[PDB]
Amino acid sequence: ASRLYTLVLVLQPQRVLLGMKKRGFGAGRWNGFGGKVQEGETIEDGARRELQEESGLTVDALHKVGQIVFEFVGEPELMDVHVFCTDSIQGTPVESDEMRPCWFQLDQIPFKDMWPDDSYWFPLLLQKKKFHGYFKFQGQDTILDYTLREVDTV
Numbered sequence: 001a002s003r004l005y006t007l008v009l010v011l012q013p014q015r016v017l018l019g020m021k022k023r024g025f026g027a028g029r030w031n032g033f034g035g036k037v038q039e040g041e042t043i044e045d046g047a048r049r050e051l052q053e054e055s056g057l058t059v060d061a062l063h064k065v066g067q068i069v070f071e072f073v074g075e076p077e078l079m080d081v082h083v084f085c086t087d088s089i090q091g092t093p094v095e096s097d098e099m100r101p102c103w104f105q106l107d108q109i110p111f112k113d114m115w116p117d118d119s120y121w122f123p124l125l126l127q128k129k130k131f132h133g134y135f136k137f138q139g140q141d142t143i144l145d146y147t148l149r150e151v152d153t154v
């Protein structure tokens with residue numbers, strides 16, 4: 001049992017777009033944009049929808065760069081997060097009820113104010129490698145187990 005989610009990183013040669021989640025799940029951490037995939041939309045549809053809702057941005061092409069499965073102890077559904085990246089965007093990012101967007105230089109990623117797993121898989125993202133990840137959490141701060149590999153098809 002899995003539930004589908006999306007995550008979108010706008011990564012340009014010298015900068016990456018992150019949003020400070022302002023409420024709800026993951027509040028207080030920088031992250032890419034995304035969320036639950038709804039019934040009746042593809043995963044990539046959901047990624048585009050969440051990006052528009054959370055930043056106002058639309059994109060021409062999203063690229064599948066990773067998949068990360070998360071277990072939280074005591075939670076019955078695994079989280080199957082599909083990670084997309086894009087370089088080209090359409091528009092200027094603007095704040096939403098959910099997200100406060102900012103550009104970060106690639107050597108100034110705020111890892112200590114991001115999900116703990118990002119420290120592990122974000123470099124592969126930055127090196128433009130495709131990857132499969134798995135992280136077991138207790139609560140929101142403690143990774144108990146993890147696996148991470150580069151793959152050829154996401």
Ligand SMILES: CCc1c(NC2CC2)nc(N)nc1N1CCCCC1
Nearest residue numbers: 005006007031034035070081115117
């Ligand atoms: C919680 C999953 C999660 C995460 N996983 C760690 C297990 C805690 N890392 C990062 N960057 N984003 C995550 N989300 C992006 C998709 C919507 C849900 C939050």
